[PDB]
Amino acid sequence: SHMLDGWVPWPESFARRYRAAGYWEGRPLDRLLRERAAADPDRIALVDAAGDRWTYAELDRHADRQAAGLRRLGIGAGDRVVVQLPNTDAFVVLFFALLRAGAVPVLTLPAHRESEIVHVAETAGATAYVIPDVLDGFDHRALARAARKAVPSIEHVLVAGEAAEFTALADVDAAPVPLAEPDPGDVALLLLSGGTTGKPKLIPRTHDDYTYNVRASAEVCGFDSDTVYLVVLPTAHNFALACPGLLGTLMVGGTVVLAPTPSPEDAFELIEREKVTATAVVPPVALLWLDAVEWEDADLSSLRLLQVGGSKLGAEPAARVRPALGCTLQQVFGMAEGLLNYTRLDDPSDLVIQTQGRPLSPDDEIRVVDEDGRDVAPGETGELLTRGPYTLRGYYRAPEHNARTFSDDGFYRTGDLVRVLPSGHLVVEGRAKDQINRGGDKISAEELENHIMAHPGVHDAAVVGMPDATMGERTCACLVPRAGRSAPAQRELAAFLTDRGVAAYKLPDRVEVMDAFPRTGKTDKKELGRRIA
Numbered sequence: 001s002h003m004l005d006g007w008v009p010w011p012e013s014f015a016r017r018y019r020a021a022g023y024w025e026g027r028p029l030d031r032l033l034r035e036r037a038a039a040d041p042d043r044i045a046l047v048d049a050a051g052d053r054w055t056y057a058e059l060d061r062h063a064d065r066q067a068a069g070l071r072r073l074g075i076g077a078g079d080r081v082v083v084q085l086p087n088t089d090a091f092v093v094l095f096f097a098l099l100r101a102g103a104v105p106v107l108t109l110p111a112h113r114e115s116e117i118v119h120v121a122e123t124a125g126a127t128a129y130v131i132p133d134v135l136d137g138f139d140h141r142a143l144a145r146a147a148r149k150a151v152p153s154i155e156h157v158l159v160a161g162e163a164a165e166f167t168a169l170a171d172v173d174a175a176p177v178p179l180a181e182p183d184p185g186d187v188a189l190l191l192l193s194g195g196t197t198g199k200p201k202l203i204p205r206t207h208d209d210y211t212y213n214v215r216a217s218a219e220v221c222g223f224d225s226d227t228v229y230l231v232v233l234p235t236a237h238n239f240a241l242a243c244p245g246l247l248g249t250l251m252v253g254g255t256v257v258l259a260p261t262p263s264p265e266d267a268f269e270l271i272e273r274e275k276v277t278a279t280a281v282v283p284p285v286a287l288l289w290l291d292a293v294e295w296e297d298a299d300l301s302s303l304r305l306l307q308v309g310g311s312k313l314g315a316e317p318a319a320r321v322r323p324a325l326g327c328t329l330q331q332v333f334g335m336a337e338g339l340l341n342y343t344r345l346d347d348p349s350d351l352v353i354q355t356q357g358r359p360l361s362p363d364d365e366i367r368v369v370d371e372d373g374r375d376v377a378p379g380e381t382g383e384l385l386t387r388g389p390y391t392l393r394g395y396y397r398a399p400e401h402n403a404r405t406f407s408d409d410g411f412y413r414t415g416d417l418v419r420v421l422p423s424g425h426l427v428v429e430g431r432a433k434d435q436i437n438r439g440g441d442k443i444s445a446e447e448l449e450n451h452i453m454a455h456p457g458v459h460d461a462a463v464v465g466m467p468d469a470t471m472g473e474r475t476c477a478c479l480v481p482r483a484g485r486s487a488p489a490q491r492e493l494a495a496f497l498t499d500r501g502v503a504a505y506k507l508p509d510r511v512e513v514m515d516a517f518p519r520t521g522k523t524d525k526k527e528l529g530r531r532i533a
C-alpha cells in the first residue's frame with residue numbers, strides 16, 4: 001500500500017536491487033535533519049540574507065513545532081500542499097515541518113502565476129497553499145484568492161508575511177507531538193517540470209530516491225561540514241534543493257546561506273561575508289558573475305566550487321571560471337525527473353570545459369537512440385533515454401503523457417540530444433522535445449501556444465526557439481491572425497498573457513505574423529525556425 005495514488009512505483013525487481021546496493025536506505029527525507037541535529041545540534045545550519053542564523057537543534061525543533069501546528073489545522077498524513085516561497089528561512093522550516101506532518105509539498109517557483117498554480121493545485125488536489133504576501137512587487141495573496149475560487153479543495157492559505165484574511169505562517173506553531181513516520185517508498189514531494197504538453201507535469205520523488213539523490217550528490221561534489229553553500233537559485237529548484245543543494249549541505253552538517261537574488265550586489269556580498277565555498281548557477285548568471293568580477297571589489301577567494309547547469313555552459317566561458325573566479329567549475333546536466341550528470345571535481349580541465357558530466361549512479365542506465373528508437377553507433381548524436389534509482393517511472397496523474405514519454409521497459413525519454421564520449425561523459429548537442437530552454441527556464445511550446453490562441457486576434461500559434469548568445473534560446477511566437485482581425489503586437493500579447501496568469505519567463509521575446517505555418521501534417525517548427533531569417 002502507498003499513501004498516494006496517481007504515481008508509478010518502480011517494479012519490485014528494481015526496488016530490490018536498489019535497496020541491496022545501498023541506494024535506498026529506508027529513511028524518511030526529514031531524517032537527514034533529525035540525525036544531523038542529533039549529531040551536531042550546535043552547528044550553524046542556516047544563515048539568511050539579513051545575517052540571522054540558526055543551529056541544527058534550533059532548525060530541528062522549529063520544524064517540529066510547525067509540524068504540530070500544521071496538524072492542528074488538519075494538514076498532514078497524505079495532504080498535498082502547494083509551496084511558493086522566496087529564499088528565506090521560512091521555506092526551510094516549512095519544508096521539514098510538512099514532511100514531519102506527513103504532508104506532501106508541491107514545490108513551485110515564485111515566478112509562477114495563476115495558470116500554473118491553479119493547474120498544479122487541481123492536479124494534486126491540494127488542500128493548502130503557502131505564499132509570501134508581496135514578493136518582487138507582486139501580491140501573492142491576490143493569487144491565493146484566485147486559486148481558492150478555481151480550486152475548491154484549498155482549505156488553508158498560509159502567508160509568510162501579512163496574512164490578511166488568511167493564516168500567518170509564523171502562527172502555525174504548537175508544542176511538538178509524536179508524529180508517525182512515512183513509508184520511505186512513498187512519495188515525499190512533488191516537483192514541477194516545464195514539460196512538453198499543454199500543462200505542466202508533476203514529478204513524484206520518494207523518500208528513498210530523493211535521499212539517494214541528495215546523499216550521492218553530496219559525495220560527488222565533496223560537500224562536508226566545512227561546506228558553506230549559497231542558495232542562489234530558488235530553494236524549490238531541484239538543482240539548488242538537492243543536487244546536492246541545501247539538502248546536501250544540511251545532510252553533511254555544513255551551512256546553508258540564502259541569497260535573495262543572483263545579482264552580484266547580493267551574492268558577492270554574501271560570499272565574502274559568510275565565506276561561501278560552493279554555489280550553483282544557471283549559465284546566464286555564471287556569465288554575469290564572470291563579467292562583474294572586473295568592476296566589483298568583493299573578496300570571493302573562499303569560493304571552491306561553482307556548479308553550472310540548467311542549460312549548456314559554453315567551452316569559452318567555462319575556461320574563464322578558474323582565472324576570473326578562482327574556483328573549480330563543475331558542469332551539471334540534470335533534470336527534476338531524475339538523472340544527474342556531473343563532471344568530477346578532479347576531472348582533467350578539458351572534460352570540465354567540454355562536457356556536461358557523466359551519470360551520478362553506477363546504476364543509472366543510458367541509451368542514445370535515433371528517430372527509429374534504435375541505439376546509435378558510439379559517439380553519434382541521438383536522443384537520451386534513461387532509467388535509474390532516482391529517475392521516475394511516470395508523472396503524477398498523467399497516464400496519457402506517461403504512455404508517450406516512457407518506453408515499455410521503463411526508460412524516460414528526456415528529449416535531449418547527446419553524444420556519449422569513450423570516458424562515459426556526455427556532450428549535450430540539442431533537443432528533440434518541443435520545449436524552449438530560455439536561460440535555464442523551461443517553456444512548453446504547446447502550453448504557451450494554447451494561451452496565445454486564447455487571444456481573440458489569434459487563430460493559430462506556433463512557438464519556436466531562437467538561438468541567443470547569453471540565454472541559449474529566446475521565444476518567438478508565430479501567429480496566424482484571427483480571420484478578418486489583426487494579431488497583437490509583442491507588448492499587447494505580453495499584457496494579455498500576464499493577466500491570464502502566465503509566468504513572466506514564458507512571455508514571447510518576439511512575435512511574427514504569417515498567413516499559415518509550414519506543415520510536414522504537423523507544424524514544421526524546423527522550417528519556421530529558419531524562416532525567422
Ligand SMILES: Cc1ccc(O)c(C(=O)OP(=O)(O)OC[C@@H]2O[C@@H](n3cnc4c(N)ncnc43)[C@H](O)[C@@H]2O)c1
Nearest residue numbers: 238239243309310311312332333334335336356428442
Ligand atoms: C543542473 C540541473 C540539476 C537539476 C535539475 O533539476 C536541473 C533542471 O534544470 O531541471 P528541469 O526538469 O527543469 O530541465 C530538464 C533538463 O534541462 C536541461 N539541462 C539541464 N542541465 C543542462 C546542461 N548542463 N546543459 C544543457 N541542458 C541542460 C535538459 O534539457 C534537461 O532535460 C538542472
